[PDB]
Amino acid sequence: PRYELALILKAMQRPETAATLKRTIEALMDRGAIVRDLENLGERALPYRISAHSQQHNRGGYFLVDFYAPTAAVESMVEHLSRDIDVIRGNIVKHPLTQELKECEGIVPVPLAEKLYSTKKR
Amino acid sequence: ATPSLRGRLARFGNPRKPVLKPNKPLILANRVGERRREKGEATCITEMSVMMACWKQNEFRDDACRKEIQGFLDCAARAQEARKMRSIQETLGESGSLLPNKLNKLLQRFPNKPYL
Amino acid sequence: YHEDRIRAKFYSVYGSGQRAFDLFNPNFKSTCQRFVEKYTELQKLGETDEEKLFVETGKALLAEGVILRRVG
Amino acid sequence: REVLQLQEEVKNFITRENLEARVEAALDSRKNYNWAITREGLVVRPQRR
Amino acid sequence: NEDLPISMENPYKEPLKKCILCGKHVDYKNVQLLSQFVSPFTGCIYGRHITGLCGKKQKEITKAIKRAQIMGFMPVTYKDPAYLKDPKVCNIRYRE
Amino acid sequence: AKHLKFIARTVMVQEGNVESAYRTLNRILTMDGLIEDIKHRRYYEKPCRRRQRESYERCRRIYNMEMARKINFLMRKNRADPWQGC
Amino acid sequence: KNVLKIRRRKMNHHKYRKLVKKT
Amino acid sequence: RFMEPYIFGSRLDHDIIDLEQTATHLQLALNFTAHMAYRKGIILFISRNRQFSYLIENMARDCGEYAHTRYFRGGMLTNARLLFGPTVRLPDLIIFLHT
Amino acid sequence: KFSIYPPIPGEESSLRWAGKKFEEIPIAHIKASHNNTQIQVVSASNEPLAFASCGTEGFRNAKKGTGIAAQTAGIAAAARAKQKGVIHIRVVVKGLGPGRLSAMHGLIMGGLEVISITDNTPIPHNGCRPRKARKL
Amino acid sequence: DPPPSTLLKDYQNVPGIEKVDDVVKRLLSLEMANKKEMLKIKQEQFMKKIVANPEDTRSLEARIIALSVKIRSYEEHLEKHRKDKAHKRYLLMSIDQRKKMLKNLRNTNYDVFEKICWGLGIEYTFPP
RNA sequence: AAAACUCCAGUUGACACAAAAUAGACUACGAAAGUGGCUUUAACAUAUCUGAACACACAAUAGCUAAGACCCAAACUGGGAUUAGAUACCCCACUAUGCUUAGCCCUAAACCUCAACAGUUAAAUCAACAAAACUGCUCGCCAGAACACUACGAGCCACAGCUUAAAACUCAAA
Ligand SMILES: [Mg+2]
Ligand SMILES: [Mg+2]
Ligand SMILES: [Mg+2]
Ligand SMILES: [Mg+2]
Ligand SMILES: [Mg+2]
Ligand SMILES: [Mg+2]
Ligand SMILES: [Mg+2]
Ligand SMILES: [Mg+2]
Ligand SMILES: [Mg+2]
Ligand SMILES: [Mg+2]
Ligand SMILES: [Zn+2]
């Protein structure tokens, strides 16, 4: 099946991030994962001070790696990502385009659900 | 908007766990409950505090802290007249809400008939 | 009835007529009744497409002497 | 039709010789998956600021 | 004779109201859409009656919100200050 | 404590209006459900009592909404005496 | 109201437990 | 519930009373009320309705009959021996304009 | 005009108070509990400047969780802050209790100015297990 | 054990196979797929080898094959995950249902019964 | 009000092997018990029904052993206030326990007390409440009570127990 990867790095502009992306692509190709495309979300700002490997990070970027990984290499990829130092965090999430958009008609006013008690004068 | 009440009560046609478990039967009455009033206020304390502070700082004479004590007296009189006008208005005047008497009268005018 | 569907289509396209509905006159012919009568007399000829029927009904209403207030 | 579409789409992938150019094009490009909505249901993208 | 009513498909039926996010795609990467459904002060998720969506729609919305908060794409206890000048959709009553 | 500082639950004061801002903050906290949540978590609540209290709150809210809708529907006939005697 | 039998059974069980704890 | 054979159909959540059997029941109603006054009978109009309480009282007054559009006491038509006098001729026909 | 939201530290922050912005304003933390409250004024560079509570005056036992004691503690803290030059403060409320606004009123009456009322109640998200429910 | 690349059911009776390259063959296989695909492939192979016509889905033989596939899957999940009570109960119930269906088949048709017993290898034991 | 700690209290920089606000105005999954922080994998049976105490498999939490951590809550414990007496209702610190691995008798108000499979109410109409009342097939129970969630017997990885289950005596009862 298809999966995604929200890769989070530190602040290195070009060389170190390119090297980490090269290492990730090599690991994916060695673990039997066909890399499709790559989406760059740009260097943004972290919503909170993260405490990953050793140092505290407060200014990192985001990357998206699209690939087709089998159902036996996900744990190995997670271990390889956790073993990295320049990688803050990264969860392997399946691709959202697999689940198609289900059709709907909206809401509907539910009537008064009667027929719950007896009809005695009491 | 009122929420749904389909699969809430434990009935014969509900093969699931009961969501809502009321103690009284869900049958609306024709009376409005009495509103709450006269609670613990304990207001107007900063004037007394500053008066005690002025009395403790200098001497315990009356001409030393005249401003603080006259402000405390004015605040106490204002609180008293405010309580008086509140007790006067809360017996015939309705602001925002309505009087429970007219409410229960209107409910008795159009009562509920659950027994069909 | 079918005139109910015709009036539904008329209210969906145009809307409320400029004349006030007088519920006291038994023979009160409003804009909806005239539209239904025109649609019926045009269907009695021999047309199937609803768009052509609607256009012909609008032309007949504009020719009989009334202003069609449509929401464009 | 689906397998023909898949065959036409698979022509643009990443293997072994397309790595440096691909990472350069990725670093030299940005994408924005953020878009707002209104009360009427229209899609408004913040890229018009 | 011919003036008798016929039980048809019940005319005078207005089309059912859709939703503000029915013909769209709910994803966790979208931060603006996930932040427009949260309080700008305490960062609380509004109820079902405040937003005005269905069951599956609100479920996907809150799941995407939680995924973005866990993975690291949107604050939890507060709202991003750069997403404040946006068209309000939820029904509020405070501030005044 | 890893998030930002003065952003969450932050108001402003306009020309010394410190009581209005405090009342606004209190209303926001009561609408978001935080003071009641703290008062509930002040003591450990058992899951049985938790479910019972939740069901009680839900049924009371439903009854209050029904009564409010009935009052809003019946307020249209809150007139005087159009027919004297009779 | 309707718990007298349950209280009697509880008292009997308590007496049985006391007898078991004794000897 | 007891209003199915007396209603033709529904026109936008509005019950339409059929006039086919309505005229048949009205002819039998007017025939039963005509022979009552023709054979020296008492007709009482009881209709607790404040909206039309003035028109009913004047119709029974000009025709020499009786009306009762006010508050109906408890033991009136039943315990008529302790609410008026010794013996009171009970009306053999009572018309209800508003049930 | 006048946005209730706080200014961002990012671009141009257009609010000035005594020649200073908003991030360089000293903080006045208040920890109001169910029976005692403490008021400490800390500068922007995280340096203690003043500290006044109910226990550092003369109140003992349950007399610390009152409005008068909290007001006196706030007045004392405001005076100790004015003795060194603070003027502008940022009140931080921590926890609930009777003396929740009395400390703020005392800090205001002491001679200080409050421009932002903040509160960071440590509400646990199903965190630690509290004590058992007492039998009243 | 089917090979990792053997074109599953959804991509089997489709024209154009020799013209397909390698990446599409590797993606449309059993490596980047789901275990349900392998189970369906095993069921189809069993229905093509053992019984004759595989089009009859509502027949008893197809139900027996499906229950056997489910039993094998539950046994694999149990030998892979030890502490699993719900899956063990489901496996026992599936075994009981398969045994009851085999009993019914033997009572109504012994030929296909013994054919299935020879094919799948299982033997209907008489309950004591 | 004690009593407890004065290596205590306060903002800040550095930190988890339990629990997962706001989505909870949702009725969802699962045979039931039970289950709502995120990510990945396997997966939730049966194209007539019922059907075990002559069987099999699960089953809230409470109790044990063999290996460890231990903020917090808390059986027991010791101290501190009132009462003629308080081993409890109020407070302080802690153990067994709530956690991870494997093995035990399987305990409940296991209460939605309503056995499962299907249907109905203008033919059928209920002592009274509760959740209005009935048609076809099938398993276990009842017919006064305490005695007795009781000894023995029959089976148990359990040796203060679990499953099944009486006799003796009293009364006009409950
Ligand atoms: Mg009750
Ligand atoms: Mg855990
Ligand atoms: Mg069976
Ligand atoms: Mg311990
Ligand atoms: Mg502790
Ligand atoms: Mg157990
Ligand atoms: Mg239960
Ligand atoms: Mg039972
Ligand atoms: Mg049964
Ligand atoms: Mg048992
Ligand atoms: Zn929708």
DSSP per-residue letters across H23-78:
HHHHHHHHHHHHHHHHTS--EEEE---STTHHHHHHHHHHTT-EEE-S---TTSSS
Q: Are F9 and I118 in contact (CB under 8 A)?
A: yes
Distance B17 CA to ligand 7 centre (A): 10
What type of residue sits at position H52?
F
At how many degrees (to 10) do helices J35-49 and J110-120 cross?
130
User: Element (H or E) spanning A79, and its range?
Assistant: helix A74-83
CA distances from F48 to B14, B16, C1, F44, F54 (A): 22, 18, 58, 12, 10
Q: Take residue H9 and report the two structure tokens written for it.
A: 């159909």
- Our measurement of CA I127 to C1' K69, in angstroms, reads 19
Q: Are A69 and J33 in contact (CB under 8 A)?
A: no
Residue J84, min C-alpha distance to chain A (Å): 21
Task: Specify the resolution in Å.
Answer: 3.0
Distance C46 CA to ligand 10 centre (A): 81
Q: Are I77 and I28 in contact (CB under 8 A)?
A: yes
User: Element (H or E) spanning H21, and its range?
Assistant: helix H20-38
Whole-number Å distance between alpha carbons of I124 and J80: 39
State how far Cα F62 lies from the chain centre. 14
Q: Are J74 and J119 in contact (CB under 8 A)?
A: no
Whole-number Å distance between alpha carbons of H43 and B54: 91
Whats the size of chain E, residue-wise?
96
Q: Take residue I40 and report the two structure tokens written for it.
A: 């400490």
Whole-number Å distance between alpha carbons of J62 and J54: 8
Phi and psi at H93, nearest 5°, equal: -155, 120
Neighbours of chain E (3+ CB pairs under 8 A): A, C, D, F, I
Cα I76–Cα I80–Cα I85 angle in degrees, nearest 5: 140
| CB of J120 lies under 7 Å from some atom of strand K | no
Q: Do chains F and D touch (3 or more CB pairs under 8 A)?
A: no
Q: Take residue F43 and report the two structure tokens written for it.
A: 């003591």
Neighbours of chain C (3+ CB pairs under 8 A): E
Candidates D22, D27, D29; nearest CB to A14: D27
Whats the size of chain G, residue-wise?
23
**Total tally of structural domains belonging to chain E:** 1
The b/e string for H51-88 (b: 16+ C-beta within 10 A; e otherwise) is eebeebbeebeeeebebbbeeeeeeeeeeeeeeeeeee
Residue B38 Ramachandran class (φ > 0 left, ψ -120 to 50 alpha, else beta): left
Tell which residue, I93, F66, G21, has the closest CA to residue A112: F66
Q: Are I110 and F6 in contact (CB under 8 A)?
A: no
Give me the residues paired with residue H9 across strands.
H16
Whole-number Å distance between alpha carbons of A48 and F1: 9
User: Element (H or E) spanning A63, and its range?
Assistant: strand A62-68
Instruction: Provide the 3-class DSSP secondary structure of residue A94.
Output: strand
Q: Report CA Rg, chain C.
A: 12
Distance A24 CA to ligand 5 centre (A): 47
Cα C32–Cα C37–Cα C43 angle in degrees, nearest 5: 125
Write down the domain spans for chain I.
1-136
Q: Are I74 and I105 in contact (CB under 8 A)?
A: yes
User: Element (H or E) spanning I111, and its range?
Assistant: none
Sheet with I88-94: list strands edge to edge.
I48-53, I37-42, I27-32, I88-94, I113-119
The domain A2-94 having CATH identifier 3.30.70.60: the answer here is yes
Residue D46 Ramachandran class (φ > 0 left, ψ -120 to 50 alpha, else beta): alpha
Whole-number Å distance between alpha carbons of A37 and H11: 61
Tell which residue, H95, H99, H92, has the closest CA to residue H56: H95
Residue H40 Ramachandran class (φ > 0 left, ψ -120 to 50 alpha, else beta): left
Q: Take residue B116 and report the two structure tokens written for it.
A: 């069909």
Q: Take residue F4 and report the two structure tokens written for it.
A: 């930002």
Number of H helices, E strands in chain D: 2, 2
Instruction: Provide the 3-class DSSP secondary structure of residue I94.
Output: strand
Whole-number Å distance between alpha carbons of C34 and E59: 51
Query: Cβ of J124: how many Cβ atoms within 10 Å?
Result: 15
Q: Report CA Rg, chain D.
A: 18
DSSP one-letter code for I6: P
Q: Are J37 and J8 in contact (CB under 8 A)?
A: yes
**Distance, first Cα to last Cα, chain H:** 16
Instruction: Provide the 3-class DSSP secondary structure of residue D44.
Output: strand
Report CA dihedral (H21, H23, H24, H30) to the nearest 10 degrees: 150
Whole-number Å distance between alpha carbons of A36 and A27: 14
| CB of J12 lies under 7 Å from some atom of strand K | no
The b/e string for B58-84 (b: 16+ C-beta within 10 A; e otherwise) is eeeeeeebeebbeebeebeeeeeeeee
Tell which residue, I121, E65, I2, has the closest CA to residue F30: I121
What type of residue sits at position I32?
A
**Distance, first Cα to last Cα, chain C:** 28
Q: Take residue H83 and report the two structure tokens written for it.
A: 């609410």
- Cβ of E94 under 8 Å from any chain C Cβ? no
Q: Are J4 and J30 in contact (CB under 8 A)?
A: yes
Who's near D8: CB < 8 A, 6+ residues apart?
Answer: none
CA distances from D24 to A10, A13, A63 (A): 18, 12, 13
Q: Are E37 and E51 in contact (CB under 8 A)?
A: yes
